[PDB]
Symmetry: C2
Subunit: 225 residues, 2 copies
């Protein structure tokens, strides 16, 4: 229980450092934020993605395993889980729309890269996990048998999409650093290169912590009567 | 059992398509292979990495869950598991040495990228899982209690390193396509862009299949007496 406390502690810390490093990076090293820059608008993409898709979803994934909720309502924890994932969906759609906007405005191509393919798959599958999850596990009419055999799929899919999102983030960082750090070139180890690489590792470690927490059987929410 | 057969079937298929797509890509679209090209030598990197690190390790990770081995020796299955992971280590070290060689020969920088940071971490941790795994679980002198509490770490770490390796592969593809596809630019959807993006997705799906297989409790190797 207290070693769980230390794990949730570390996960929260690394996660918040991921968001801080995202913000510091776009504000300091890049040009900033804004709703038309146009790269000012683009840099909403990494910031949103880290914030909702990696961090908020990272937390939503393990919301049920907090002990101070075990004797809380299941319908309430379903509400927190659904809603937290929902904030993360909204933010990720906003983040993808930002890129489609900066690109259509600036006459760049869409969906040519592997980062966008994987990314868009993870987004679509995230909304399918959200819709099925909401129309089976929150909603009332779904027969208990349908919950019974959707559940292992739904847990697995959640972990898979989480990982895929981490992998797409690291691909995103790479694309941005290679495109942007031309002179000083990325190869020359410039300050933004080390800073962003570190943010990468933080996003990675945070994934590792969330996976550890979420795969302890001794911290699963104790089964309902 | 037969739905397991179909899963191992699909995993093997997608895995072999990953290796085929790697080879077709470096041989067709790039310049080829060789032990001094110098990019001929480099293109050993993706090919080796896909082959040993993604595929051979993908198989080693689920070797114990094949039913036709459940009433086989545990020491034998430990041998296959160890040895398969060992082939994958050898190949991955060869693959990293290839890059350090092409780069030192051609005066490029080392370890400036996030793909190399994560990649090198995954390699070091893969050799630490290999050494600890070999000096606890194959070797005789390790007290059963030390196996008892190393095991959940060791399973977790294996799954984490597998995923990290998948993420580093996708980062690698991205780097290579962005560096190499200058004219026709990657953005222009050239044939190699679609082919390699597809190889990316195959590497991804293969990871998903291996994770599904390896997290079915009904396919864990039945515990020793
Ligand atoms: C993109 C959206 C979602 C993702 C990534 C996701 C992910 C997950 C994950 C990873 C778990 C395993 C947690 C654990 O066992 O500790 C889980 C459990 C669960 N999820 Fe979701 N989920 C999503 C949407 C939803 C929605 C909308 C609902 C609606 C009620 C829902 C209901 C549940 C339930 C009931 C559990 C079982 C909790 C337990 O007793 O351990 N999920 N989810
Ligand atoms: C991890 C979750 C992420 C997802 C799911 C995701 C998804 C996407 C999608 C669908 C696109 C295509 C948009 C378009 O074609 O206009 C895109 C573009 C892009 N993203 Fe991400 N993204 C993520 C994170 C990041 C991060 C953290 C960065 C950091 C800089 C980044 C950098 C880029 C860049 C440079 C592009 C345009 C180049 C391209 O089309 O590949 N992405 N992303
Ligand atoms: C990089 C090297 C390695 C990786 C990635 C790795 C990965 C894994 C994974 C993912 C599992 C879980 C499989 C399952 O539960 O179905 C596992 C199980 C196991 N591994 Fe390893 N392993 C490595 C090295 C070794 C070595 C050298 C040994 C030496 C004997 C070993 C011994 C075992 C044992 C005994 C099990 C339990 C099998 C069972 O009864 O289910 N591992 N390994
Ligand atoms: C997935 C497992 C992989 C691992 C663990 C890995 C690891 C590494 C390491 C440690 C380096 C640094 C070598 C040096 O600095 O000279 C490197 C470089 C490189 N790798 Fe990978 N690699 C992997 C897969 C791939 C794949 C599939 C490609 C496909 C083209 C690729 C493309 C590159 C490129 C272009 C470089 C040089 C640029 C750089 O330093 O980032 N890698 N890799
Ligand atoms: O609706 C639900 O389904 C799961 C599980 O019981 C499925 O077997 C769960 O925790 C609910 O409250
Ligand atoms: O976000 C991007 O960065 C590069 C380039 O615009 C930098 O000048 C690019 O092509 C993107 O899509
Ligand atoms: O050496 C071993 O340790 C594990 C497990 O028993 C640990 O509890 C296993 O399968 C062995 O043969
Ligand atoms: O493997 C590589 O591809 C590019 C470049 O060499 C292509 O001309 C680069 O810098 C690498 O390290
Ligand atoms: Zn852009
Ligand atoms: Zn090179």
């Amino acid at each position: 229980y207290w070693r769980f406390l230390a794990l949730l502690g570390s996960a929260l810390l690394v996660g918040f450092l991921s968001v801080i490093f995202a913000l510091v990076w776009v504000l300091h090293y890049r040009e900033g934020l804004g709703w038309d820059g146009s790269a000012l608008e683009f840099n909403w993409h990494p910031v949103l993605m880290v914030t909702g898709f990696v961090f908020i979803q990272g937390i939503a994934i393990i919301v049920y395993r907090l002990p101070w909720t075990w004797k809380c309502s299941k319908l309430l924890m379903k509400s927190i889980h659904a809603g937290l994932n929902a904030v993360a969906a909204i933010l990720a759609i906003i983040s993808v729309v930002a890129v489609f906007e900066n690109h259509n405005v600036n006459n760049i191509a869409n969906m040519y890269s592997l980062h966008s393919w994987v990314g868009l798959i993870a987004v679509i599958c995230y909304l399918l996990q959200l819709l099925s999850g909401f129309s089976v596990f929150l909603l009332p009419w779904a027969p208990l048998s349908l919950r019974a055999f959707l559940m292992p799929i739904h847990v697995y899919s959640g972990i898979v999409i989480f990982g895929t999102v981490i992998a797409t983030a690291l691909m995103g960082l790479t694309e941005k650093l290679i495109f942007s750090l031309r002179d000083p070139a990325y190869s020359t180890f410039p300050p933004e290169g080390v800073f962003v690489n570190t943010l990468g590792l933080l996003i990675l470690v945070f994934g590792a912590l969330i996976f550890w927490i979420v795969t302890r059987p001794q911290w699963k929410r104790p089964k309902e009567p």
